[PDB]
Amino acid sequence: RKKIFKPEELRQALMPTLEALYRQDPESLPFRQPVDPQLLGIPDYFDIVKNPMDLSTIKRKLDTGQYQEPWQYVDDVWLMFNNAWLYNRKTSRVYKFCSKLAEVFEQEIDPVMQSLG
């Protein structure tokens, strides 16, 4: 019927896919902590980005058992990517780095999602 996932199983299976993103340098650097619009010059950020997401938040959600099923994790990774592509200019470091992370993530996540069902 509905498949139940234990938080420790999700963490064991999915954390390596997150670690693959963290390992990218310089590409993960903009994504390791939440965007701070006041520190940066950018008070329009949260006008445009309604649901912020970043690697530290996704990690915390895996660590604290906030995901019930693996597609919720995938959706947060993609939310992070889509926010960055929505806000940032195509020539920017953040935009290009986002694209690299999306390439890495795609390769990592597919066999893991097959394994989890």
Q: Say how far apart CA 115 and CA 113 lie, in whole Å.
A: 5
Q: Does 29 bind ligand 6F9 (CB under 6 A)?
A: yes
Which residues, 71 to 100, sit near ligand 6F9 by CB under 6 A?
84, 87-88, 92-94
Residue with smaller CB distance to ligand 6F9, 36 or 106: 36
Q: Does 30 bind ligand 6F9 (CB under 6 A)?
A: yes
Q: Say how far apart CA 60 and CA 88 lie, in whole Å.
A: 25
Q: How far is the CB of 56 from ligand 6F9 (least distance, A)?
A: 12
Q: Say how far apart CA 47 and CA 81 lie, in whole Å.
A: 17
Residue of 10, 31, 61, 70 interacting with ligand 6F9 (CB under 6 A): 31
- The tokens for 3 are 């498949």
Query: What stretches of 23-69 show up as alpha helix (H) in DSSP?
Result: 45-48, 55-63
Residue pair 42/89 in contact by the 8 Å Cβ criterion: no
Binding site for ligand 6F9 (CB under 6 A): 26, 29-31, 35, 40-42, 45, 84, 87-88, 92-94
